[PDB]
């Protein structure tokens, strides 16, 4: 069994991650300290692919936590199961980075990737045989967009022969959640299509609806974790470009809806060039947006090929 | 409804190259008539755009 | 409740709507009124991303502020339009539109119809265009000194005025290098092929335009050379890795040797790609996609330096600069696609980062302007000013006609319009003469921002412009005195001033046509 | 106001308000950072929201760690960040000179003088001051003694005196080791590793490399004397085929054959390594160390241990170059045709365990063009402080080498430039003489703060120093132990010409732009939501 | 006029919940007060008469101990200066293993006296100068205060007498038994080479009986059962596999592709015949015990039972590695029979029941090996954890003695001699440094003062007696805890001794921590997250 390293970026990512690392820890008996307060041996059967046992029988998780703003990782330390993590796997900057994709993907938080990469190496070295990585982030939003794609990128350059299984919080259709979300999400999809091997699209809108059905902000990070374990607790991606998924209970072409929406709001804003000065004045060329758009019409047509 | 299932590794290379040579041949057939302007409702990969560039044609996707 | 329209649909109408639109417009104008001329002052804007924008540029300011009145929205949009079209005059246009709407408010209060005012405005616009074209002068664009003076006359009103000679030379070199012709179509694309890279630190006086391009990149492998004195360069859109096929190419192994044979086939594929590349005997290979470590091995064995993941725009600029042609299949590589023309590839450490220079090119049709300075904000402002300068140089190289600045053109046109109005006997003579006197706002604003006596100076200037050969007389924005522009040297591009006048008059026409606001209704 | 009629929830600072706001924030930053300046400065403690402790005297670190939300403070922090990224030192002095320029300009603007005229005087004085700096710079053959004095002038300000006397020799030797004649200094070739076990004065220079990892096979030796180093970038773990493959068998025997066969590809690379090892080490006299940038699975680790090879996995992309420069081999991305010329030599290789971490030392290289600084210390915050200090010192020595000139310190150049500016002032036309005077009184903030921090009267000390410099013309500064004037070039207090020039340039520029700010305005969305 | 506004500048630019302290009053004195409170929280645990504390952490876990570093770890210290003193104490624990409470006491004393000196009018710079020169003098002096040395670490009576002192502060009532146990273990695992590894002393805490039933075991104990039917073995030939005890499978997805009824009928029989062959090769190598780090398959277990092999499953990889070190084996990643060198040996391997707990014991008969285990019996998990901490103290003392064999007298004797000599040095040193030197000297008095206070006697009378005897010349005299009244006796002749390295590092680290706390002048706390 090969080991899987788990990076989590941005507020959304850092708050899905902790909940996942808690669900599974309780699925394995590990307490907040790390001691295996468990009886069954199936919990230890496949525990090496997630936890990196140390001397003293303390199972440290193979998890990195990243965000340009420290205040989320502080809330993760202080939260529950916030002490199993390695006190050095917390990599944070000082700049908030707003919600600009260019800010997170460029010199405005670019050196940090060189601090998360010497933690990816220090976490892969422990792994006997590294299966790959699992990055949890948000498609568009805060740093998760920019920093979540400069990470997929630099980790596909540094380890270009490993499974990169992303969990991204695709933006909900009703809630804009941000004025530059169409841009961030087309710019991030434009990187994930190339530098990723399998992407699970976790829609906040659908997750919120499922939570309401169960009832008949935390509740969403508690309704995404049981799906993240039903995906990572045990024949897909026929074509190496249609690797986007919608979990449930699905490699559906309903993704095409989300993509049509994102590309039509992208095109609406791009026509008037609204909120473009920030990207150009901080390190993008006005042609990266045309490329992103082209590549999203590409995706939408590849997905329209079936029906 | 078509799958590639290889049981002799020596065919993989030719199959992979054919996947691109098909489009290459279509583009060459189009350009052989004298077409210097090519309008398309669909997409055009970079591999194809390079053929148009070398031919001195104008392609639009 | 039995309504006909949904609640939240509020409908205003009439002179209240007209006066509201006009007040919103002239408020947008008053926001940036003081940012005009050489003696303007900076404004510190606070971005929603915790950023800061320290600028004098009307379009920068209006782009960073947010409004809810649709008239103010329209004014911001016309400022953006002016900036995108000519790249200068973004506050002159705003001020002119504000003044035109202000003077039209008068006639609107006095029972004149907005359509009458609008027709008068259009007559006046046509005559403004005629008068500008009459008072314009030509330019010998081969006179580098004349072009440098034009660029100084365009950047003197900005922060870089302290480094005027430097910025003028940078802009002129950049535009003259980006000037490109293919198939009988001249094209100055200073947005795709003139690149500004801001590296904080250093001093601005070492900023330069490179005879080549610059990217933030390092060699893929430290055994690769970092200095090449006549590099033959190859550009690729394809990954030199072994990637999967487009189909369901699933394999089925039953024999023992087959797994190893497949891995060795992958290695041999990479070898064959690298051999297809080496066959052209290049020195540098630059890719937009990845380069596998085995490919790096083979290239290094061939003594080739590789750069892994460059942007598509940077790759296009490298193509234009070094004379190469981007390829996507190394089997389809030809000597004509190889890049000869670069005189030096250097990879040097600026601060704690590695930057790749492809400079010393001969006939480079692309460039990188390397800006150095105190901080990201100072360098953003310098970059905006350089964008203004290059856009002015481009406008000149396109339309070599010049008109005098310092408000001299505004006063000349106002005088010509007042003289032409004496033949008008209908009721439109009054709004016509009103826009004529509304053009005086540019010299008025110049005098206000220099700190001189508007009444006295504008009177002396209107009097000077009543003489015969005095249409070149204007004002100093630095001393508050009248001068001849032939002696001062402030000459604007006819295209710039035409676009200014046209956009202003049409914005006034639009906002005058507008009445009866409606709101609330949801898409 | 105008903006508030269109965006009602808009914040605006106009003309005088704007200037008051900016100058107040600048003076606040100056008030905080005044105490950082000089070796007699005070160390500030900085506690994160999580509770992590930072002990620092560094202006840039202090800026970024302070809890501030002011636009002018952000501007000045950015100017300091650029200063630090390009020169490594001068951030505190940068902030101080900005604050004092703003104060001296407010002194005249409150009396109705225009900031434009003050900025004209600022630019004239900047020009003349740069000229005087070029005049006073001391072009010197950069010998170890000069570099030691420079690194001392930096490290004594950044850390304690005994630790500074240690870091001085460490840093100077490191740079003098990784430095090639007429070849820009790649500071990347100086690794900086921190160990958290011993005293802070144990910080040393290892003439080799220190990797933060060791061998992952227990039977592998922990010490190797005469070692052949193989720097490779070749995966020695199980690699799956790019195209989806899968195995199909009809019997457990066939399954066993396929299990043995699926590893043949990596076994072949292991065999190549083992054959090279046997060919170069015909006996157990010498040693053989494989250092892989990529992974090594347990089967390969066992196969190499059986042959007596020490294999390290997942090294750093920088350690590839550092190893090829220290040991002297060739870093490989393939074992196609590997030969003994691809190997480096290390006169000693061993392993050091510290709690849960392991370290690997590679020492006794012949003439390593890459070295490492081992930062030893009892606390994480001590280690961070020493890291910052050695960064400062490395940048200082590198700059003193690059610019063969070096400028006297202790405020001597500032005093002399103030005197020169005051003698040049009459040659300035109009009321820009007042801007020149303000520039001079701003330059005089370095000796003033040095005296204030050593515990002396600013005016009395500065009067003594200016008098001594006017009577003799010698470049004199503050003696931080007696408050008397002293010749910095004779007592060995040196500053970086590049740092002083960057100070002048960037401080003038940012102060000019701030003085020319006449409206601060927040009228955007105010959030990206 | 009813509100004081924040002053212009940093006070206004400061964030909402951030705090800024500056100067002797707001920063230095408050830090000294915090460190003093810390030293007071841990003072009553110092020495053999030190009392235990029951700290409950945020996870509702209970710690009953008088181990300073443990108490500090389990407390939620939130003041940064106290955090720094705790960092010093933990560095002392890491470097030496004993002396954390000394570090705390001494740092707190140095800081209290530094506050006193600042109040009388010295500057932090002068205080730090004097503290540093006095620490240097103390380091110069201590080697001369060294009284005895170990002279042999392969014996069991000498080693027990040497560890008794370190294991007296903890578990004062019963220390001869524990010193015997820890000496037996340390000298069993002490190799002919001078290197001693503390991880080779294993501690098994088993419920039931009490500390007098504890024992040493030359080998290993695992709270496991056997996977198969065999439970005892008398001439173990252990074979260790890091791989599961199952048929090897492909790392790439394997599929059993059947195309004929014959293949379908024969697949399972072929699989079983293969497993039988594998395990029979292992058994025919002579191995009677197999230890797998992975899982066990039903068929493999069947055939191991058939061929009379004891199967053991060690979930942990550290457990597997330590068993390999114990028995002299090599973990094989394949299920191939081991060669004569890859195999391990034990004089016995058996399943036993210590109390309610079932355990598998790999027991050597020889009085040596690479690993030894101490089986701790006890009536309470907290009691057994405290005894494990005492064992850790004894083992780290043994390692310190392997590093440096020098010993100084305990019970405050070295502290009093240091105080005396540094006072005599400061009386000669002129300048304002003498005040700080004399306070650094007086700080040492805090150690015998804390010992006396916990012993239950008048610390002032004790310290006066000690000063008198050390003035008349006896440097090995310290206080007698076995006395209802203030008393003193020869620490050397009594056998109460400390480690030169322990004292050296404790003094160094305490001085460095105090000096850093003093060097702090401004504090800029951020808004506490949460
Ligand atoms: N030194 C000067 N003296 C007087 N007028 C000037 C001077 N420099 C520029 N101008 C005039 O100021 C007007 C606007 O300058 P500028 O601020 O660059 O444009 P905008 O106001 O559109 O930003 C130009 O029409 C030009 O004629
Ligand atoms: N031993 C010394 N005696 C007198 N002046 C010194 C001494 N060491 C440094 N200085 C001066 O103190 C000033 C500030 O030093 P430092 O704090 O290292 O730079 P910065 O303030 O930019 O961080 C320097 O300009 C230097 O000239
Ligand atoms: N029998 C004894 N009589 C007097 N003092 C003793 C005796 N045993 C130990 N001590 C003293 O107790 C101190 C150890 O206390 P302890 O709680 O171990 O502190 P630390 O763990 O920080 O060393 C030593 O300084 C030693 O001198
Ligand atoms: Mg302009
Ligand atoms: Mg400094
Ligand atoms: Mg003790």
JSON list of N, CA, C and O in Angstrom, two decimals, chain A residues 212-236:
[
{"chain": "A", "resi": 212, "resn": "UNK", "atom": "N", "xyz": [-30.22, 20.74, 4.42]},
{"chain": "A", "resi": 212, "resn": "UNK", "atom": "CA", "xyz": [-31.62, 21.15, 4.73]},
{"chain": "A", "resi": 212, "resn": "UNK", "atom": "C", "xyz": [-32.52, 19.91, 4.71]},
{"chain": "A", "resi": 212, "resn": "UNK", "atom": "O", "xyz": [-33.40, 19.78, 5.59]},
{"chain": "A", "resi": 213, "resn": "UNK", "atom": "N", "xyz": [-32.30, 19.02, 3.73]},
{"chain": "A", "resi": 213, "resn": "UNK", "atom": "CA", "xyz": [-33.11, 17.77, 3.62]},
{"chain": "A", "resi": 213, "resn": "UNK", "atom": "C", "xyz": [-32.87, 16.92, 4.87]},
{"chain": "A", "resi": 213, "resn": "UNK", "atom": "O", "xyz": [-33.86, 16.35, 5.39]},
{"chain": "A", "resi": 214, "resn": "UNK", "atom": "N", "xyz": [-31.62, 16.84, 5.33]},
{"chain": "A", "resi": 214, "resn": "UNK", "atom": "CA", "xyz": [-31.27, 16.05, 6.54]},
{"chain": "A", "resi": 214, "resn": "UNK", "atom": "C", "xyz": [-31.99, 16.66, 7.75]},
{"chain": "A", "resi": 214, "resn": "UNK", "atom": "O", "xyz": [-32.49, 15.89, 8.59]},
{"chain": "A", "resi": 215, "resn": "UNK", "atom": "N", "xyz": [-32.02, 17.99, 7.82]},
{"chain": "A", "resi": 215, "resn": "UNK", "atom": "CA", "xyz": [-32.69, 18.70, 8.94]},
{"chain": "A", "resi": 215, "resn": "UNK", "atom": "C", "xyz": [-34.19, 18.37, 8.91]},
{"chain": "A", "resi": 215, "resn": "UNK", "atom": "O", "xyz": [-34.77, 18.16, 9.99]},
{"chain": "A", "resi": 216, "resn": "UNK", "atom": "N", "xyz": [-34.77, 18.33, 7.71]},
{"chain": "A", "resi": 216, "resn": "UNK", "atom": "CA", "xyz": [-36.22, 18.03, 7.53]},
{"chain": "A", "resi": 216, "resn": "UNK", "atom": "C", "xyz": [-37.04, 18.92, 8.46]},
{"chain": "A", "resi": 216, "resn": "UNK", "atom": "O", "xyz": [-37.92, 19.63, 7.94]},
{"chain": "A", "resi": 217, "resn": "UNK", "atom": "N", "xyz": [-22.71, 27.19, 8.84]},
{"chain": "A", "resi": 217, "resn": "UNK", "atom": "CA", "xyz": [-21.57, 27.05, 7.94]},
{"chain": "A", "resi": 217, "resn": "UNK", "atom": "C", "xyz": [-20.83, 25.74, 8.22]},
{"chain": "A", "resi": 217, "resn": "UNK", "atom": "O", "xyz": [-20.38, 25.06, 7.30]},
{"chain": "A", "resi": 218, "resn": "UNK", "atom": "N", "xyz": [-20.70, 25.39, 9.50]},
{"chain": "A", "resi": 218, "resn": "UNK", "atom": "CA", "xyz": [-20.05, 24.14, 9.87]},
{"chain": "A", "resi": 218, "resn": "UNK", "atom": "C", "xyz": [-20.76, 22.92, 9.32]},
{"chain": "A", "resi": 218, "resn": "UNK", "atom": "O", "xyz": [-20.13, 21.91, 9.01]},
{"chain": "A", "resi": 219, "resn": "UNK", "atom": "N", "xyz": [-22.10, 22.97, 9.28]},
{"chain": "A", "resi": 219, "resn": "UNK", "atom": "CA", "xyz": [-22.86, 21.83, 8.76]},
{"chain": "A", "resi": 219, "resn": "UNK", "atom": "C", "xyz": [-22.44, 21.47, 7.34]},
{"chain": "A", "resi": 219, "resn": "UNK", "atom": "O", "xyz": [-22.51, 20.30, 6.96]},
{"chain": "A", "resi": 220, "resn": "UNK", "atom": "N", "xyz": [-21.90, 22.42, 6.58]},
{"chain": "A", "resi": 220, "resn": "UNK", "atom": "CA", "xyz": [-21.45, 22.05, 5.24]},
{"chain": "A", "resi": 220, "resn": "UNK", "atom": "C", "xyz": [-20.11, 21.34, 5.32]},
{"chain": "A", "resi": 220, "resn": "UNK", "atom": "O", "xyz": [-19.87, 20.38, 4.57]},
{"chain": "A", "resi": 221, "resn": "UNK", "atom": "N", "xyz": [-19.26, 21.73, 6.26]},
{"chain": "A", "resi": 221, "resn": "UNK", "atom": "CA", "xyz": [-17.99, 21.03, 6.40]},
{"chain": "A", "resi": 221, "resn": "UNK", "atom": "C", "xyz": [-18.18, 19.70, 7.10]},
{"chain": "A", "resi": 221, "resn": "UNK", "atom": "O", "xyz": [-17.25, 18.89, 7.15]},
{"chain": "A", "resi": 222, "resn": "UNK", "atom": "N", "xyz": [-19.39, 19.47, 7.63]},
{"chain": "A", "resi": 222, "resn": "UNK", "atom": "CA", "xyz": [-19.75, 18.21, 8.26]},
{"chain": "A", "resi": 222, "resn": "UNK", "atom": "C", "xyz": [-20.59, 17.34, 7.33]},
{"chain": "A", "resi": 222, "resn": "UNK", "atom": "O", "xyz": [-20.80, 16.16, 7.62]},
{"chain": "A", "resi": 223, "resn": "UNK", "atom": "N", "xyz": [-21.02, 17.89, 6.19]},
{"chain": "A", "resi": 223, "resn": "UNK", "atom": "CA", "xyz": [-21.73, 17.12, 5.19]},
{"chain": "A", "resi": 223, "resn": "UNK", "atom": "C", "xyz": [-20.85, 16.88, 3.96]},
{"chain": "A", "resi": 223, "resn": "UNK", "atom": "O", "xyz": [-21.23, 16.12, 3.07]},
{"chain": "A", "resi": 224, "resn": "UNK", "atom": "N", "xyz": [-19.65, 17.47, 3.95]},
{"chain": "A", "resi": 224, "resn": "UNK", "atom": "CA", "xyz": [-18.69, 17.18, 2.89]},
{"chain": "A", "resi": 224, "resn": "UNK", "atom": "C", "xyz": [-17.71, 16.11, 3.35]},
{"chain": "A", "resi": 224, "resn": "UNK", "atom": "O", "xyz": [-17.14, 15.40, 2.51]},
{"chain": "A", "resi": 225, "resn": "UNK", "atom": "N", "xyz": [-17.56, 15.91, 4.66]},
{"chain": "A", "resi": 225, "resn": "UNK", "atom": "CA", "xyz": [-16.57, 14.98, 5.18]},
{"chain": "A", "resi": 225, "resn": "UNK", "atom": "C", "xyz": [-17.03, 13.54, 5.01]},
{"chain": "A", "resi": 225, "resn": "UNK", "atom": "O", "xyz": [-16.22, 12.66, 4.71]},
{"chain": "A", "resi": 226, "resn": "UNK", "atom": "N", "xyz": [-18.31, 13.26, 5.27]},
{"chain": "A", "resi": 226, "resn": "UNK", "atom": "CA", "xyz": [-18.78, 11.90, 5.07]},
{"chain": "A", "resi": 226, "resn": "UNK", "atom": "C", "xyz": [-18.68, 11.50, 3.60]},
{"chain": "A", "resi": 226, "resn": "UNK", "atom": "O", "xyz": [-18.35, 10.35, 3.30]},
{"chain": "A", "resi": 227, "resn": "UNK", "atom": "N", "xyz": [-18.84, 12.45, 2.68]},
{"chain": "A", "resi": 227, "resn": "UNK", "atom": "CA", "xyz": [-18.59, 12.14, 1.27]},
{"chain": "A", "resi": 227, "resn": "UNK", "atom": "C", "xyz": [-17.10, 11.99, 0.99]},
{"chain": "A", "resi": 227, "resn": "UNK", "atom": "O", "xyz": [-16.71, 11.13, 0.19]},
{"chain": "A", "resi": 228, "resn": "UNK", "atom": "N", "xyz": [-16.26, 12.76, 1.67]},
{"chain": "A", "resi": 228, "resn": "UNK", "atom": "CA", "xyz": [-14.83, 12.63, 1.42]},
{"chain": "A", "resi": 228, "resn": "UNK", "atom": "C", "xyz": [-14.33, 11.29, 1.93]},
{"chain": "A", "resi": 228, "resn": "UNK", "atom": "O", "xyz": [-13.44, 10.68, 1.33]},
{"chain": "A", "resi": 229, "resn": "UNK", "atom": "N", "xyz": [-14.99, 10.75, 2.95]},
{"chain": "A", "resi": 229, "resn": "UNK", "atom": "CA", "xyz": [-14.62, 9.42, 3.42]},
{"chain": "A", "resi": 229, "resn": "UNK", "atom": "C", "xyz": [-15.26, 8.33, 2.57]},
{"chain": "A", "resi": 229, "resn": "UNK", "atom": "O", "xyz": [-14.62, 7.30, 2.32]},
{"chain": "A", "resi": 230, "resn": "UNK", "atom": "N", "xyz": [-16.45, 8.57, 2.04]},
{"chain": "A", "resi": 230, "resn": "UNK", "atom": "CA", "xyz": [-17.01, 7.59, 1.13]},
{"chain": "A", "resi": 230, "resn": "UNK", "atom": "C", "xyz": [-16.30, 7.57, -0.20]},
{"chain": "A", "resi": 230, "resn": "UNK", "atom": "O", "xyz": [-16.56, 6.67, -1.01]},
{"chain": "A", "resi": 231, "resn": "UNK", "atom": "N", "xyz": [-15.42, 8.53, -0.43]},
{"chain": "A", "resi": 231, "resn": "UNK", "atom": "CA", "xyz": [-14.58, 8.53, -1.62]},
{"chain": "A", "resi": 231, "resn": "UNK", "atom": "C", "xyz": [-13.20, 7.99, -1.25]},
{"chain": "A", "resi": 231, "resn": "UNK", "atom": "O", "xyz": [-12.57, 7.30, -2.06]},
{"chain": "A", "resi": 232, "resn": "UNK", "atom": "N", "xyz": [-12.73, 8.26, -0.03]},
{"chain": "A", "resi": 232, "resn": "UNK", "atom": "CA", "xyz": [-11.41, 7.77, 0.33]},
{"chain": "A", "resi": 232, "resn": "UNK", "atom": "C", "xyz": [-11.40, 6.80, 1.51]},
{"chain": "A", "resi": 232, "resn": "UNK", "atom": "O", "xyz": [-10.64, 6.97, 2.46]},
{"chain": "A", "resi": 233, "resn": "UNK", "atom": "N", "xyz": [-12.25, 5.77, 1.45]},
{"chain": "A", "resi": 233, "resn": "UNK", "atom": "CA", "xyz": [-12.30, 4.76, 2.51]},
{"chain": "A", "resi": 233, "resn": "UNK", "atom": "C", "xyz": [-12.12, 3.34, 2.01]},
{"chain": "A", "resi": 233, "resn": "UNK", "atom": "O", "xyz": [-11.87, 2.45, 2.83]},
{"chain": "A", "resi": 234, "resn": "UNK", "atom": "N", "xyz": [-12.22, 3.09, 0.70]},
{"chain": "A", "resi": 234, "resn": "UNK", "atom": "CA", "xyz": [-12.02, 1.75, 0.16]},
{"chain": "A", "resi": 234, "resn": "UNK", "atom": "C", "xyz": [-10.54, 1.49, -0.08]},
{"chain": "A", "resi": 234, "resn": "UNK", "atom": "O", "xyz": [-9.68, 2.27, 0.34]},
{"chain": "A", "resi": 235, "resn": "UNK", "atom": "N", "xyz": [-11.65, 2.37, -13.06]},
{"chain": "A", "resi": 235, "resn": "UNK", "atom": "CA", "xyz": [-13.04, 2.18, -13.46]},
{"chain": "A", "resi": 235, "resn": "UNK", "atom": "C", "xyz": [-13.70, 3.55, -13.61]},
{"chain": "A", "resi": 235, "resn": "UNK", "atom": "O", "xyz": [-14.92, 3.68, -13.60]},
{"chain": "A", "resi": 236, "resn": "UNK", "atom": "N", "xyz": [-12.87, 4.58, -13.75]},
{"chain": "A", "resi": 236, "resn": "UNK", "atom": "CA", "xyz": [-13.34, 5.95, -13.88]},
{"chain": "A", "resi": 236, "resn": "UNK", "atom": "C", "xyz": [-12.38, 6.70, -14.80]},
{"chain": "A", "resi": 236, "resn": "UNK", "atom": "O", "xyz": [-11.29, 6.22, -15.12]}
]
